[PDB]
Design an enzyme around this catalytic site. Structure first.
Site, mmCIF file in Angstrom:
data_model
loop_
_atom_site.group_PDB
_atom_site.id
_atom_site.type_symbol
_atom_site.label_atom_id
_atom_site.label_comp_id
_atom_site.label_asym_id
_atom_site.label_seq_id
_atom_site.Cartn_x
_atom_site.Cartn_y
_atom_site.Cartn_z
ATOM 1 N N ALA A 81 8.435 -37.524 -7.906
ATOM 2 C CA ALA A 81 8.531 -37.842 -9.318
ATOM 3 C C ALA A 81 8.476 -39.323 -9.448
ATOM 4 O O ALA A 81 9.353 -40.035 -9.002
ATOM 5 C CB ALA A 81 9.796 -37.297 -9.956
ATOM 6 N N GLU A 102 0.812 -1.209 0.000
ATOM 7 C CA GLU A 102 0.000 0.000 0.000
ATOM 8 C C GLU A 102 0.843 1.256 0.000
ATOM 9 O O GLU A 102 0.540 2.238 -0.715
ATOM 10 C CB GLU A 102 -0.880 0.028 1.251
ATOM 11 C CG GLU A 102 -1.734 -1.135 1.456
ATOM 12 C CD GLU A 102 -1.137 -2.124 2.373
ATOM 13 O OE1 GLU A 102 -0.119 -2.641 1.957
ATOM 14 O OE2 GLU A 102 -1.663 -2.391 3.466
ATOM 15 N N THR A 104 18.734 -40.040 0.131
ATOM 16 C CA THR A 104 18.752 -39.258 -1.128
ATOM 17 C C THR A 104 20.077 -38.556 -1.328
ATOM 18 O O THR A 104 20.630 -38.541 -2.419
ATOM 19 C CB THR A 104 17.587 -38.230 -1.146
ATOM 20 O OG1 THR A 104 16.356 -38.937 -1.174
ATOM 21 C CG2 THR A 104 17.618 -37.365 -2.372
ATOM 22 N N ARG A 113 10.696 -24.283 -5.958
ATOM 23 C CA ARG A 113 11.884 -23.980 -5.177
ATOM 24 C C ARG A 113 12.153 -22.491 -4.982
ATOM 25 O O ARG A 113 12.807 -22.129 -4.019
ATOM 26 C CB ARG A 113 13.114 -24.695 -5.724
ATOM 27 C CG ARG A 113 13.033 -26.190 -5.653
ATOM 28 C CD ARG A 113 14.375 -26.846 -6.028
ATOM 29 N NE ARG A 113 14.284 -28.303 -6.018
ATOM 30 C CZ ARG A 113 15.137 -29.098 -6.642
ATOM 31 N NH1 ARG A 113 16.180 -28.613 -7.274
ATOM 32 N NH2 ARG A 113 14.959 -30.397 -6.612
ATOM 33 N N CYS A 128 -2.258 -2.878 7.626
ATOM 34 C CA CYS A 128 -1.774 -2.958 9.010
ATOM 35 C C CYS A 128 -2.167 -1.690 9.696
ATOM 36 O O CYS A 128 -2.269 -0.638 9.082
ATOM 37 C CB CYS A 128 -0.261 -3.116 9.094
ATOM 38 S SG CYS A 128 0.734 -1.772 8.440
#
Ligand SMILES: NC(=O)C1=CN([C@@H]2O[C@H](COP(=O)(O)OP(=O)(O)OC[C@H]3O[C@@H](n4cnc5c(N)ncnc54)[C@H](OP(=O)(O)O)[C@@H]3O)[C@@H](O)[C@H]2O)C=CC1
Ligand SMILES: NC(=O)C1=CN([C@@H]2O[C@H](COP(=O)(O)OP(=O)(O)OC[C@H]3O[C@@H](n4cnc5c(N)ncnc54)[C@H](OP(=O)(O)O)[C@@H]3O)[C@@H](O)[C@H]2O)C=CC1
Ligand SMILES: [Cl-]
Ligand SMILES: [Cl-]
Ligand SMILES: [Zn+2]
Ligand SMILES: [Zn+2]
Lengths: 349, 349
Positions: free
Chosen positions: B159, B55, B200, B188, B81
């Protein structure tokens, strides 16, 4: 102008053709509309194998209504036949009706249908070819495959969890497909045959019927190489459909209304055998060993998924083996979803 | 009339807000447009954590252009705010600008933001609430989760092949995602943290970076309960992002720029720890054990699929166990596909 109108009319002709799916096989589904001064004045479809041709139904309908067909246009999914069947060919009917323009989706790949396009053009008629041709070839893909490749069109349909399981750790497969079950019964109402292995029969004792009350049951093809289904009346052997069991067992015995086909049982022999029994399409429905064997032979794969997750269980293609280095053999052509389920249509690259 | 215009303007405000995703966290993304006599005359977005409010950017822009804001309308995604930060609150700025109408997508769930809506209405301003509210809550879902549940929003991304494998029989996972890789890097660039297990890291030695050159790397959270990654410099320990390793090993030693967080390593402790490090969102990227542990805690699941089929391999959720009798816990909210890949977005029921 006209070409957009020809597509609109061809769309209706396709919609008409579809009324015969599952009944015309191994003939193609065919739709026909007769248009005069921009209005559809009659319609027709091929209703069943060996029934009246769509063009004849539409032209006879028009005449019954008192329509003068001289100068009218026919829009038809498939090139009209130019052979005397029981009746004179559709080419002669169309010519004699006074129809001046014939709009075709695709030419007939069957040699015995003759040279309809040429006959029409030799009798002064305007022949427009290829309107919505791709859509019409999809419509007739069973027939096109049957005629051009001399085998049935093969679809492979499975129901899997997100993690690729067609059964849980107990071998249970119930309740995977729910909101997309209607797609399966639609397929069963259209494919000439459905195919399962004996492990599925032993484990699930399935009906494999089309559950649409006014649908029709497809031919059941049961693969029982070893004759483990001998001497028992499984629900697939109920006498509510034609039933063929492929087996290498001479000893095996099945109920008297079931055809026992003693075979080497190669996919190749099965497909040739089905072609020779006038089956233009087969829906392979499992289980894992069967999926594994037919996967390289499928013209289309339908993966029905659920957001269920089993963790451990029977993999869809447990008999197959590949690795990361092998490129994908299928492209995604469509996805649909509802609630906790999704359907992926894949076609060979 | 106006309400359709308010939706059009709110759409642009959302588009503006998105320019700060990944930079504002754990603040919400916010967009603002100032409209006068039906024309957007200025725009603003929250650019980074602790930066100017949307704003303020929009109102200061307008003033710089010489626009008279008296009688203008502000359309803003989140309720302005009403607390003095470094600057006076946005409520005071808006009031003093002469803006007569404030259109809000959703109220701010953070108590410290105060009663903006009420202050405005006490200074004669027309406050319209709830324009495209659902879209705005989706936009701010990280912040809404952070504030209201005191934990990060959790996404789980995998995946998989058609048969539910995240690796082939050799444990190889390369080349499953290809044409949809851009979706991963987008994620990401937006999620504050990405999370993987040590199996992994050991197997794949991944970068886990945002591969968009002008993007930004997310925080890497590595789960290494047993300290098997100790004493080695894996690519996840490169100093190109903040890195946190959760472990129960006192012995384990990681490079000096990596935060070692000695923990009981429950999902609950990990999520609390991340909340306490101002992380509003985490993208769980594997592997199988990790997927299995986080699945019940995911706010969204993204299943990236390939039409590859491995036959045998490492299942997505190899640590989970369920069976056919358990109803699905997710609904499909979106599917996308391209070539040999498809992406399913699922949300908890
Ligand atoms: N969710 C789903 O889509 C479905 C899940 N299921 C589940 O799958 C399981 C059954 O799968 P599975 O156990 O692999 O059994 P299959 O249904 O694949 O049956 C295998 C049997 O069929 C025989 N067979 C395979 N190929 C041929 C062929 N070319 N000609 C003649 N016989 C052949 C095999 O012979 P041989 O022994 O010599 O190899 C074996 O006896 C059950 O748990 C069932 O619940 C089943 C169907 C669909
Ligand atoms: N296609 C895809 O989406 C991806 C595939 N992969 C493949 O997955 C495989 C790796 O999977 P997997 O072997 O299951 O290994 P994970 O990556 O799931 O790692 C498991 C390790 O992480 C530790 N761990 C798990 N949960 C926690 C926790 N809450 N806190 C601390 N430590 C934790 C385990 O500890 P403990 O031993 O005590 O249980 C174990 O040491 C590789 O083959 C890789 O190629 C990997 C990621 C994605
Ligand atoms: Cl059934
Ligand atoms: Cl990576
Ligand atoms: Zn004919
Ligand atoms: Zn503010």
């Amino acid at each position: 102008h006209h070409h957009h109108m020809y597509e609109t009319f061809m769309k209706r002709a396709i919609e008409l053709a579809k009324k015969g799916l599952g009944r015309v096989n191994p003939n193609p589904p065919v739709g026909a509309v007769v248009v005069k001064d921009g209005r559809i004045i009659a319609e027709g479809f091929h209703p069943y194998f060996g029934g009246p041709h769509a063009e004849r139904m539409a032209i006879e309908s028009a005449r019954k209504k008192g329509e003068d067909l001289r100068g009218a246009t026919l829009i038809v999914t498939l090139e009209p036949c130019d052979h005397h069947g029981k009746t004179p060919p559709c080419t002669d009917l169309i010519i004699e009706s006074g129809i001046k323009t014939v709009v075709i989706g695709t030419r007939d790949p069957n040699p015995v249908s003759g040279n309809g396009v040429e006959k029409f053009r030799n009798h002064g008629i305007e022949v427009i070819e290829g309107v919505l041709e791709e859509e019409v070839k999809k419509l007739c893909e069973f027939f096109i495959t049957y005629v051009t490749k001399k085998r049935p069109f093969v679809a492979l349909k499975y129901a899997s969890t997100l993690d690729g399981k067609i059964a849980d750790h107990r071998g249970d497969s119930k309740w995977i497909t729910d909101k997309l079950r209607f797609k399966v019964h639609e397929m069963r109402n259209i494919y000439s045959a459905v195919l399962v292995g004996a492990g599925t029969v032993l484990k699930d004792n399935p009906q494999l019927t089309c559950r649409l009350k006014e649908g029709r049951n497809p031919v059941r093809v049961i693969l029982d190489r070893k004759g483990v289904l001998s001497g028992k009346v499984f629900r697939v052997f109920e006498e509510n459909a034609r039933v063929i069991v492929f087996t290498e067992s001479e000893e095996a015995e099945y109920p008297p209304h079931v055809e026992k086909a003693l075979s080497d049982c190669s996919v190749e022999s099965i497909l040739r055998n089905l072609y020779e029994r006038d089956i233009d399409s087969v829906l392979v429905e499992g289980g894992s060993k069967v999926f594994s064997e037919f996967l390289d032979h499928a013209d289309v794969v339908f993966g029905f998924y659920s957001t269920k997750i089993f963790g451990k269980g029977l993999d869809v293609f447990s008999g197959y083996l590949s690795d990361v280095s092998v490129p994908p053999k299928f492209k995604v052509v469509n996805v649909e979803f509802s609630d906790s389920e999704f359907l992926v249509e894949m076609r060979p690259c």
